[PDB]
Design a protein around this ligand. Sequence first.
Ligand SMILES: NC(=O)c1cccnc1
Ligand SMILES: NC(=O)c1cccnc1
Ligand SMILES: NC(=O)c1cccnc1
Ligand SMILES: NC(=O)c1cccnc1
Ligand SMILES: [Cl-]
Ligand SMILES: [Cl-]
Ligand SMILES: [Cl-]
Ligand SMILES: [Cl-]
Ligand code: NA
Ligand code: NA
Ligand code: NA
Ligand code: NA
Ligand code: NA
Ligand code: NA
Ligand code: NA
Ligand code: NA
Lengths: 392, 392, 392, 392
Amino acid sequence: MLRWITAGESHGRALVAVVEGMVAGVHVTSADIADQLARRRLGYGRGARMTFERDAVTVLSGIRHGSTLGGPIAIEIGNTEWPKWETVMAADPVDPAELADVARNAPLTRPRPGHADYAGMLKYGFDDARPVLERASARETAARVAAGTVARAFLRQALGVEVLSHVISIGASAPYEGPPPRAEDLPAIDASPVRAYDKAAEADMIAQIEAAKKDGDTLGGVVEAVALGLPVGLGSFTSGDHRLDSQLAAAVMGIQAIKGVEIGDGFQTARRRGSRAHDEMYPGPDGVVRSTNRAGGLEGGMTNGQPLRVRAAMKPISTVPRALATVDLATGDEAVAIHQRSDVCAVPAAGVVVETMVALVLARAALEKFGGDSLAETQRNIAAYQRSVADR
Amino acid sequence: MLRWITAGESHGRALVAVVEGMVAGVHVTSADIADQLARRRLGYGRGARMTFERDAVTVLSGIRHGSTLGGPIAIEIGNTEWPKWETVMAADPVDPAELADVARNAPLTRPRPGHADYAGMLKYGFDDARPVLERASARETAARVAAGTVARAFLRQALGVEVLSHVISIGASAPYEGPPPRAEDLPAIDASPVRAYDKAAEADMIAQIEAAKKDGDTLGGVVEAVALGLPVGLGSFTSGDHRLDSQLAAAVMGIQAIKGVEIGDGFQTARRRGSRAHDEMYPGPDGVVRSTNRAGGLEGGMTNGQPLRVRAAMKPISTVPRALATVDLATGDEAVAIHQRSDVCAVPAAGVVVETMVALVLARAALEKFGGDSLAETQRNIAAYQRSVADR
Amino acid sequence: MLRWITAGESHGRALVAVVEGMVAGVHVTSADIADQLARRRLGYGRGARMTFERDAVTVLSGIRHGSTLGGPIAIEIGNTEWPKWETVMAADPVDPAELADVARNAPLTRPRPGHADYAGMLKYGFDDARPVLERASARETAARVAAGTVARAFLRQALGVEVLSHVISIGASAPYEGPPPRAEDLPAIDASPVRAYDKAAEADMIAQIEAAKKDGDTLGGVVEAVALGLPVGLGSFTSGDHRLDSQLAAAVMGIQAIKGVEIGDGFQTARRRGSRAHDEMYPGPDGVVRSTNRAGGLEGGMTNGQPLRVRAAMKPISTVPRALATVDLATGDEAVAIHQRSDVCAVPAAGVVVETMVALVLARAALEKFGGDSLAETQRNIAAYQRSVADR
Amino acid sequence: MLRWITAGESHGRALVAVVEGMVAGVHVTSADIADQLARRRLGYGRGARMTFERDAVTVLSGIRHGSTLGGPIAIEIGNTEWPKWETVMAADPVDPAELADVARNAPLTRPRPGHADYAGMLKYGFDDARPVLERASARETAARVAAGTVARAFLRQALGVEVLSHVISIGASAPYEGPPPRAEDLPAIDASPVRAYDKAAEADMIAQIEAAKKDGDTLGGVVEAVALGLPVGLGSFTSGDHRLDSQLAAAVMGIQAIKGVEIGDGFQTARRRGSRAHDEMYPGPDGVVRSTNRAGGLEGGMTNGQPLRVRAAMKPISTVPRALATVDLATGDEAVAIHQRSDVCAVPAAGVVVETMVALVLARAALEKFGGDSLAETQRNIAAYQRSVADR
Ligand SMILES: NC(=O)c1cccnc1
Ligand SMILES: NC(=O)c1cccnc1
Ligand SMILES: NC(=O)c1cccnc1
Ligand SMILES: NC(=O)c1cccnc1
Ligand SMILES: [Cl-]
Ligand SMILES: [Cl-]
Ligand SMILES: [Cl-]
Ligand SMILES: [Cl-]
Ligand code: NA
Ligand code: NA
Ligand code: NA
Ligand code: NA
Ligand code: NA
Ligand code: NA
Ligand code: NA
Ligand code: NA
């Protein structure tokens, strides 16, 4: 089975992604990985969060001469700020007397509302929030995106599938409810300050961000990931855990700051009558065709061949300076929460991470159905299935 | 690790639930299971879907004298309609000539929009939808509820945790946005025709159902499961898959007809400014207290001690008679989809299933943190943790 | 992924096996299951352990008209002795005053050396061994064999693979070290009182059993499972857990009373020089051929196309009357262990269980490589792989 | 759950180990890791396999100031020979014309008997053995040992458990069948050229190696890992996969070149009568005591408190120069296998790897029973269990 794991602290020496169970023969390079990582730098005000200097990407294992080997793929992402943190986040012991004179090593005892700090401190018995926030930080999503690049390459090469995203709403903007983009629209989306597909929505969202920035506040939003070209029959109806919507929901809701996930029209579908809620089927040249995609490409836990549409609701992830009451756990005193990040809105970049998690799940589901140990083998199995479906 | 699996076809001989990894010493009985199963009969018009005769519950393994043994727990739920289906759904071969004279055995070749039928037929290479719909059917949720009863008993006995649900909206009703219920409110909720906690919302929802029923249409809705009494620190921030919101989203989205999941204020949180989106913390007698629960009891992937609130969006699950165009896959001809169920709205009963899936995930997470092989052992570990938290 | 789980107590109402992840379209019937279950009745003196009355087999789910459906397959095996145990092993509470008058309900507080009793009592905090021995009992292997029948059917139909076993040694017999049997030899083996393939070894083993029976003692032995017809490349070298020898060792060592597992010549291979330890390769008509199979069909974690040979060492599983000192945990007093079973040797029947566990692992590994959701799909993928190998 | 994964090719840039699910608060350092890695350099003739220059160890994540953080722990092990391989094993594409002039890049088309080469080439559709041998190589066991160090630290700190190993036999030596060593014996064992605990066996084994070295041959052997101080009740009898012997067998048999695994007296137990096969129990001051440990510390799938003894049979792992016939898969011609390693015997070093795999499994099983997210929490749970057992 395709599996992925991330490791690293935000201010540690490096991040690591390991992907296990990918077939041999998939073409992917360090440049491909760096290109996807660069897409996390996108978005109005993103420079408040990310440093200009790009981190070094190193493929440590599992790829030779631009082709996967079949074994575990380990990718390392450096931390350009490591020299500042090499004592505070040293792996090995440091003289506590030396540490006592390092202002940067001071414990953090005032948990931020909305973050892992409080519950994590209690759970792990930490008197300092540092070990919690270092691992909880959305910097970890860089490692996800490295892993996701492998999944993306597989999906394109094996199935001709493309994954992209666009932003539906930020703050109080009027949601974009038109058709999703296609792959050819990605350049324009990624050139939008808010990674919008619609110009009216783009202007509205930019205005929301400007107003929040002026007020010293922060915003969340809704993003839609779109996967095009999928075959019918990934996922299964045979049990709850095998339903592709279950798997996608796990992967997307597990992203930092995500508080909701929908497939297609989601919560709006729940407000519709059955006569207008579903996608009717009609005869077409090369099989059954639909005129609507309210289902968002999944029915009964499986891909139906329509575009897959997965929406994620992101809470505002940056703590508002001076606004939020908390408690100093060291003393029990009232306190004010201090922020770790200063960006107003991370929704556009969060979209890129949603794409990644969707790609990983889709690649896993494809390998479950089509099997194979090399790309050519998987491709033969796919072709045979496609022929058997066509011959119906 | 706590694990659960369901088996059975809707019209097969019986359903089976197996729960593996529950500690010994949890008090649970066949009567407890039957009581939870009875809660699936709740809801206005539910008798259109469920037969009056109650199915037989049999505990086959893993419980002795009302106490779990520590091994796998297998629960069987009979099918009162089996005599009608004992040939059509016979496990063993039947003379195809005999089968040819059984009208009930006719293949189903007109997939219903919104259901597993089409994709499942293609995926598994079936020329008949029967094997797909028999396993995809929400009758399988009975087996889930049997398993969930074990989880519920554990949560109550080990942690003093209660799980309940109430309905937020059905069709175009105005959503109930007030506080959630407590455990003591469950009798009144379960006595409501729409399992509502609010009388205004109840009337509105009943009206929606009446109008849909008159129009020969069907409805979905939104339900909120609520878990009370949880300790701080179930789930973790250490990776996406360990976040309790990820796990809950998987379990809830994997329920038939669910198209969206939210934690707390979910999608509305994405429309709020950071200054009003989160739950501020204040000093209190026995620790930190909050005045709001916008987070729905989870922050950074972990329980924070507030009520857990998980909302599920359900599409309308019953196919509207004569409304939906489809294709006869045998001929390629246009067709009209024929319904398998006739109930207008299954939202209230679906709430009971959401409760079950939440309970299973919570029990698994509790056993992950607190360990133990017997209830008394787990309880000692819980008490020690609670003391260590209190002593802060 | 193919998964299997067993549930049941020895004296409970029934056993249940559930197999999840088997493809649709595999031909298997209740008669096939009963036939494999009957093979557990084989062996000299087996009637000391098994009652003459055959247990009822019922397929509850996942098979229709003799063909798998693709969903979970649940098989129930009745307990003919249930009426004797229906109070002592009742699932629901019984008046403790009534129980106090039932001699059969007396707690067991004298753990048997060599069994789960002592450690299980301590682990789970039981003051009675009953709940431990009821689940630990090798009666549970009946449920394994039911599950294994599904795996066997798949292996035969998809790959033309056969799994069998023969006994190498019992007690102090001289081990049979000749070639393994082929499928056509199974009738003769199953007709042997000790399921031997060699007549000299058969006589020696029968003599050992006769001597032990006269002395009131018990015996273990060594069995070899053999799987024929496997394709090259099941399992992988990419990590320890993916090595097929790792997976087979887990499955076989997890059988009750097994204390050792070898692949091919195992421990003897460790005593040989490299010049005589391995299987040299030579040109042949339809590919590479070997003249020896010291490796037992696995090299570097993968099938090499030779017969797979897996040997299991079984300790003597029946407690010797009056021989073994133990402690009464209720009092701390010295005691003598009392036996639960009276058979001298269960090695022949244990062989049948080893076959089953090998079949389950092989079926899982085949589905991992070849994928597919229906048998025809898996078969096409297999054929394509076989062609690609042949074309080398 | 505790999980471990390794990544890396033998001649790649680096190896990586990731351990997920270890509690926070375990004291472990890069020096501890390097010390365990150094123990792989032990053994007569080991310098034929390992280069004098020690590889760099870098802890990338999951440990701060010598204490685990609770998140994933990633450890990197450098490759001192990388400059020689940086083109041949480059991750990114290299001009095939440039590669054509690099003798080191020549494909390997003559699979070695006894290795992954042949089956791996066929499985993955490789025309070159290089990608197979690079990942299959026992160099990967360095990454295992890095991960195992974390497990070892946890076992010592949480449970007072020590894991060690000694060599039982090499080639045709007379096996050492005396008592196992204790922790205090490790210095002497690690100072033995063959890591023997017995002086007679040591001399015999050294003689075997000398004779094989003179004859240009290679040897395997048998090693015993010993774990001391374990609590009663790790593992379970509730299913085959939960039996600790199953889990240990998987972990040990998954080590390169291992062809057999035994618990305690293993295969010899299968040749004994029940009256002499098991460990009788007697009253003692602080509980039940045994006078023998034929069981090797496990009964019914669980630790019984005696020393755990796990034996592994290793085939000879280095290919004998000029001895083994194979086939050139490029041409179909007969060929002779060429060796990748030149050491006569790797049994002593293999023992260190067996220790590591045992430690990982034991740590996982301990965390399953005792739970906890920090060491102090786990320790409290352990103490409470120990008290509850003592109070019996
Ligand atoms: N990159 C980010 O800052 C981010 C924040 C939240 C979710 N995903 C990504
Ligand atoms: N019981 C039901 O009919 C049902 C339908 C959809 C989801 N959950 C339960
Ligand atoms: N059927 C049996 O009695 C048995 C005993 C031990 C192992 N496998 C089967
Ligand atoms: N280090 C080694 O060479 C080795 C070989 C085989 C098994 N384990 C380790
Ligand atoms: Cl912040
Ligand atoms: Cl319907
Ligand atoms: Cl016995
Ligand atoms: Cl070699
Ligand atoms: Na390929
Ligand atoms: Na669409
Ligand atoms: Na208890
Ligand atoms: Na609330
Ligand atoms: Na088929
Ligand atoms: Na053979
Ligand atoms: Na600690
Ligand atoms: Na010992």
